[PDB]
Amino acid sequence: EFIPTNFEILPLEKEATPYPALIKDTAMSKLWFKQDDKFFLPKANLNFEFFSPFAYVDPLHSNMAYLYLELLKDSLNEYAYAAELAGLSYDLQNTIYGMYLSVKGYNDKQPILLKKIIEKMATFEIDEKRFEIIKEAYMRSLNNFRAEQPHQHAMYYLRLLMTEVAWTKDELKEALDDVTLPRLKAFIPQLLSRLHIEALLHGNITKQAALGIMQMVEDTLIEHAHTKPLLPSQLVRYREVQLPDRGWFVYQQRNEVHNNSGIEIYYQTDMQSTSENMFLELFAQIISEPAFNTLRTKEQLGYIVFSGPRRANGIQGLRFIIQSEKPPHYLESRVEAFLITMEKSIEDMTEEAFQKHIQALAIRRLDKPKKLSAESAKYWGEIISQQYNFDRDNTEVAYLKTLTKEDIIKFYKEMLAVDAPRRHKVSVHVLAREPEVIQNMTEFKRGLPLFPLVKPH
């Protein structure tokens, strides 16, 4: 029931910001807030990150976190679905860093519902055969990972190689022999003991009641297990590996199931500066549409052929996701033919190609939101990257029109040419069922540098 009365719209106050302001920061939590200006709807959306150290400590802890949230979902689904039937949808998911909480719906009863959600996932129990079915089930999903689509395989190996630490699915497979009820049951209060909160509150709501409810919530967190905040030195992130400025390295991975060869051709550009976002977006699109002309039709590589940006750890990147059944060096050679095609296709650009193209980028980028969850998802998508540049849109567009033909030529050469000093190229071969070598990826990653992080504005 939960008092479905108050659907009223709340008028905007003195805090007449168009972007979410950080209304509370502690060592326990960090709180951003934004009333709805454009839509004025009787709705609210809430997103929560619970940051905690125990997440990527070891493949065993990751499995336990998984199973925790997984069986947690299995526990609460039976209670939650009738309230979800009332028009309040949600999602619980995980991060490599922490936990992902979504609360979406009306303004009327999210405080009571979220209250009972916190009270519910605080005091948590395990059934035996339930644990076995879920265990076996994810065990299937794990050794299944030999049998999926090579574009996912390629993105998995790329996010393996180009992060700081990475636990393979093999280790995850072998370690499931030890997941016992007492071991998880020891793990559970340890995890929830000490953690960090981060929250998005967005809708026709107030700041003070948001602070009081959020306060109430973290006070309940302290009420259960005597929660203490985290230390501000263990809010670390994982950096990304610096290529030694010239290397073009490659290796191979042999699939077992699919008679298909994926391939991902990674390029380190740079951190997201304001110039580099528009460099990479515009250059990506200038190699986008002629690729639609030449790759499927003319070069006939495959059907799942993809190229483009990479947004991870605050670091930009360039990729070529292609799954087909080919020799990988043969496929690389026609990718290099496409690189020659785009290289001269730069220098053959008229003013017209340029102008239609930058207007294409413009309408590609420009759109007003259409629902509070969309804009809230973009803002959350900025809070997870800890950037907060709320008006990067206007600045990047204002920069975007201030480009020349020669502006991307000077962008092109040092990173992409064959005689290039800043060429950061690396590919990953995924084989079908039938530079330097990389023997041990730890010993590979041993003597390679690490990129800096972004200054928070």
Add this chain to the structure above:
Amino acid sequence: EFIPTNFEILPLEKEATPYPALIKDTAMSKLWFKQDDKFFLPKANLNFEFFSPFAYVDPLHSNMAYLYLELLKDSLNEYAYAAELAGLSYDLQNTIYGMYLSVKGYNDKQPILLKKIIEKMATFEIDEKRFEIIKEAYMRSLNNFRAEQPHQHAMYYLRLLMTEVAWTKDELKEALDDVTLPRLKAFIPQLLSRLHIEALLHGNITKQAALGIMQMVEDTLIEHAHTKPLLPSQLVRYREVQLPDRGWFVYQQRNEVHNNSGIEIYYQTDMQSTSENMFLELFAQIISEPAFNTLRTKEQLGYIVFSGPRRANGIQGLRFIIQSEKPPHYLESRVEAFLITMEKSIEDMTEEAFQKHIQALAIRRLDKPKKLSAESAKYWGEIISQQYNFDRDNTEVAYLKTLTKEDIIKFYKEMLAVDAPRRHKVSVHVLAREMSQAPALPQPEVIQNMTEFKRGLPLFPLVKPH
């Protein structure tokens, strides 16, 4: 009963290697061993190192590790005294890596005592009031670390800044407010679940008996806590902080007791490449005696005046440790004045200073070991640094004959001078309790948050192991 009857000199075998070979490799361990051709004593060394991810993850489990090993030795002391009286030493220690074991002594009950030690710390129990005493007592030992001399305190900050992760002593101090005995006792076998041992064994035993001792140990572990081997992706090390190629950064702390300011002046040259070893060593000796001659002696700056190299994490370095009662920037100015003094003193070198200086550097570096415990500490210090290049001596001497003096200007200009494009300069201030011509150096940065400092900063590569 630990009195020996083993007085038998073992004849050296057909296996006449001058350096320890990897005689046993598993996914669990890695084992290095030699025996003394020269020294001929019935004694042996043992340097077991436990390795674990969970050691330095947080203040809390590290606190539990230290209190564990403390009450561990405290329990096994009353037995240990007869061995210690006989010349059978041991040491349990903790590292940033894991826990550190170093046994040394005679050839009597070596597998036997080691068997007991491993089996004891394998299955170990806790008393209540014993836990209260270890808690309270090391808790009292914590806030004493405000009170030490700032050269020691500054070297703590040096190993603080020049690593990847580092827990300060306050946060580590505060985290013991909630440590109860059941949390530790739950923690312990989880700690002991998986771990790595890599050991150097040196002295009067054989190869096959060493294989049996190693097997013994790991089998004892698998017997107790069912230890399984690691995978080689969790063979991590910590990286070291990049400097932004021209920056000179500094900050200050303040002591309460001492009325003196300290300083340590760090310089990132480079990794130990063949050139850089003889470069920095030669520069270290040429900055050794004249700094002692003019700064501490002649200028009478202070008493805790120290100069010289720094070698940590496979990274060379140059540091200057000076505690005195001075303004530290004033002190910087005369440090830099000494740099100009040395700069001029370079070009004034004849061939006699040159030849006597490099020969004295050679004899400073070259010496055959006298005590067996010394050479084991050097080799061990190289095994923990994962270098293993034991024939670095021939390497260094062969490189040494190929040096000039203009090379050290080439060393001086981009790396050490003030007009440097490749300037990697960093000092550390430590204030006192209450707080002859220098040019205008560029401005330093204030450093409020060391974490937010290290946040966007690159990290160094690691070393290819020899």
